[PDB]
Design an enzyme around this catalytic site. Structure first.
Site, PDB file in Angstrom:
ATOM      1  N   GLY A   1       0.835  -1.034   0.015  1.00  0.00           N
ATOM      2  CA  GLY A   1       0.197  -0.091  -0.001  1.00  0.00           C
ATOM      3  C   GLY A   1       0.844   1.221   0.028  1.00  0.00           C
ATOM      4  O   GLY A   1       1.979   1.277   0.533  1.00  0.00           O
ATOM      5  N   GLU A   2       0.336   2.131  -0.712  1.00  0.00           N
ATOM      6  CA  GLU A   2       1.125   3.452  -0.701  1.00  0.00           C
ATOM      7  C   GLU A   2       0.967   4.446   0.473  1.00  0.00           C
ATOM      8  O   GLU A   2       0.559   3.948   1.612  1.00  0.00           O
ATOM      9  CB  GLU A   2       0.387   4.426  -1.848  1.00  0.00           C
TER      10      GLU A   2
ATOM     11  N   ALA B   1       1.662   9.167   1.390  1.00  0.00           N
ATOM     12  CA  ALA B   1       2.879  10.322   1.192  1.00  0.00           C
ATOM     13  C   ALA B   1       3.721  10.155   2.621  1.00  0.00           C
ATOM     14  O   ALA B   1       4.333  11.216   3.165  1.00  0.00           O
ATOM     15  CB  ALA B   1       2.191  11.587   1.058  1.00  0.00           C
TER      16      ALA B   1
ATOM     17  N   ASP C   1      -4.116  10.057  14.574  1.00  0.00           N
ATOM     18  CA  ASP C   1      -4.731   9.709  13.313  1.00  0.00           C
ATOM     19  C   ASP C   1      -5.574   8.262  13.323  1.00  0.00           C
ATOM     20  O   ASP C   1      -5.467   7.684  12.594  1.00  0.00           O
ATOM     21  CB  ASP C   1      -3.808   9.819  12.187  1.00  0.00           C
ATOM     22  CG  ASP C   1      -4.713   9.927  11.001  1.00  0.00           C
ATOM     23  OD1 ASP C   1      -5.833  10.485  10.742  1.00  0.00           O
ATOM     24  OD2 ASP C   1      -4.381   9.900   9.669  1.00  0.00           O
TER      25      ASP C   1
HETATM   26  C1  LIG Z   1      -2.129  -7.835   4.221  1.00  0.00           C
HETATM   27  C2  LIG Z   1      -1.712  -6.572   3.833  1.00  0.00           C
HETATM   28  O1  LIG Z   1      -2.007  -5.239   4.493  1.00  0.00           O
HETATM   29  C3  LIG Z   1      -0.882  -4.224   4.370  1.00  0.00           C
HETATM   30  O2  LIG Z   1      -1.034  -3.696   3.322  1.00  0.00           O
HETATM   31  C4  LIG Z   1      -0.206  -3.838   5.588  1.00  0.00           C
HETATM   32  C5  LIG Z   1       0.191  -4.784   6.278  1.00  0.00           C
HETATM   33  N1  LIG Z   1       1.156  -5.092   7.318  1.00  0.00           N
HETATM   34  C6  LIG Z   1       1.698  -3.505   7.932  1.00  0.00           C
HETATM   35  N2  LIG Z   1       2.485  -3.288   8.657  1.00  0.00           N
HETATM   36  N3  LIG Z   1       2.725  -1.998   8.838  1.00  0.00           N
HETATM   37  C7  LIG Z   1       1.948  -1.283   8.020  1.00  0.00           C
HETATM   38  C8  LIG Z   1       1.899  -0.072   7.275  1.00  0.00           C
HETATM   39  C9  LIG Z   1       0.878   0.377   6.796  1.00  0.00           C
HETATM   40  C10 LIG Z   1       0.741   1.804   6.391  1.00  0.00           C
HETATM   41  C11 LIG Z   1       1.592   2.667   6.808  1.00  0.00           C
HETATM   42  C12 LIG Z   1       2.573   2.236   7.772  1.00  0.00           C
HETATM   43  C13 LIG Z   1       3.622   2.938   8.285  1.00  0.00           C
HETATM   44  N4  LIG Z   1       4.425   3.921   8.633  1.00  0.00           N
HETATM   45  C14 LIG Z   1       2.662   0.729   8.070  1.00  0.00           C
HETATM   46  C15 LIG Z   1       1.320  -2.478   7.033  1.00  0.00           C
HETATM   47  C16 LIG Z   1       0.169  -2.734   5.886  1.00  0.00           C
HETATM   48  N5  LIG Z   1      -0.307  -1.497   5.259  1.00  0.00           N
HETATM   49  C17 LIG Z   1       0.466  -1.518   3.675  1.00  0.00           C
HETATM   50  C18 LIG Z   1       0.128  -0.133   3.187  1.00  0.00           C
HETATM   51  O3  LIG Z   1      -1.429  -0.104   3.062  1.00  0.00           O
HETATM   52  C19 LIG Z   1      -2.186  -0.371   4.279  1.00  0.00           C
HETATM   53  C20 LIG Z   1      -1.974   0.901   4.984  1.00  0.00           C
HETATM   54  N6  LIG Z   1      -2.450   0.581   6.200  1.00  0.00           N
HETATM   55  C21 LIG Z   1      -1.673  -1.533   5.056  1.00  0.00           C
END
Ligand SMILES: CCOC(=O)c1cnc2[nH]nc(-c3cccc(C#N)c3)c2c1N1CCO[C@H](CN)C1
EC number: 2.7.11.1
Length: 251
Positions: A13-14, A16, A111
């Site tokens: 996932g993306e 900024a 947030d």
């Molecule tokens: C199974 C897929 O889920 C995810 O994409 C995902 C999985 N594990 C994660 N651990 N930490 C994150 C994450 C997400 C977003 C921002 C940050 C920071 N700093 C850490 C994470 C996952 N995210 C990936 C990006 O897209 C989603 C945003 N919550 C999830």
């Protein structure tokens, strides 16, 4: 040999805050999430954090974070329906546990929304993304906040109308909005201002309208205490844990 080496497998996932990728260990096949990029603050704050309901930080631009295979709480919310009350309560319990911890060490996430609440393989909730987080207590001295942070549907009303405000009630409020989203599958307002008809209706106690209509009286009672406009009159977390629904056995 080879234990330091990770293969990037797919973009998760993306943001900024940067693109996030899935790393798997060559040798151990352990899976972590790698952030790809202020940024020094996020890393500093992550280093303080150790808790079952907060995304684990492994080290470090590359940030190494706990992979949550369950994805986002956001995706266990059926639009206009929500989810089964027992699951919502469990998730809420775990959210409170995580927020109690953070506040315990003087950190506010700022947030809190379902997109930032991830789930592991056992569906345990983890508070994620501390890129907007800040210290609100240091050396046992509280410092008020004044910068607008977060997401409009989830921000507390004092944040829109006050120059300064306490950090904790803000986190409590957004948790309230999350609870709402979990039980009704919809957000009550675009923002908590008096030009938002929906927010106006809530203040006048018209709970016969959605989303409140879809919410049982017990959880709604709790929401009546969380979503209070005056942050001084708003329920604190210690008292949330004494609420009747919070302690209602559910199956
Ligand atoms: C199974 C897929 O889920 C995810 O994409 C995902 C999985 N594990 C994660 N651990 N930490 C994150 C994450 C997400 C977003 C921002 C940050 C920071 N700093 C850490 C994470 C996952 N995210 C990936 C990006 O897209 C989603 C945003 N919550 C999830």
């Amino acid at each position: 040999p080879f234990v330091e080496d990770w293969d990037l497998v797919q973009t998760l996932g993306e943001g900024a805050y940067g693109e996030v990728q899935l790393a798997v260990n060559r040798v151990t096949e352990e899976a972590v999430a790698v952030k790809i990029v202020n940024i020094k603050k996020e890393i500093c704050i992550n280093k303080m954090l150790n808790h079952e309901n907060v995304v684990k930080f492994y080290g470090h631009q590359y940030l190494f974070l706990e992979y949550c295979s369950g994805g986002e709480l956001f995706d266990r919310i059926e639009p206009d329906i929500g989810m089964p009350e027992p699951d919502a309560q469990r998730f809420f319990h775990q959210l409170m546990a995580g927020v109690v911890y953070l506040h315990g060490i003087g950190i506010t996430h700022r947030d809190i929304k379902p997109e930032n609440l991830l789930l592991d393989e056992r569906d345990n909730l983890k508070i994620s993304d501390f890129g907007l987080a800040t210290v609100f207590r240091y050396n046992n001295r509280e410092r008020l906040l004044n910068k607008m942070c977060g997401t409009l549907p989830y921000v507390a009303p004092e944040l829109l109308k006050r120059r300064e405000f306490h950090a904790e009630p803000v986190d409590v409020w957004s948790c309230g909005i999350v609870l709402t989203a979990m039980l009704a599958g919809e957000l009550p307002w675009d923002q908590p201002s008096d030009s938002c008809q929906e927010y106006s209706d809530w203040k006048e106690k018209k709970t016969y309208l959605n989303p409140w209509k879809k919410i049982d009286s017990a959880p709604l009672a709790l929401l009546h205490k969380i979503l209070v406009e005056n942050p001084s009159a708003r329920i604190t977390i210690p008292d949330i844990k004494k609420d009747r629904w919070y302690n209602k056995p559910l199956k």
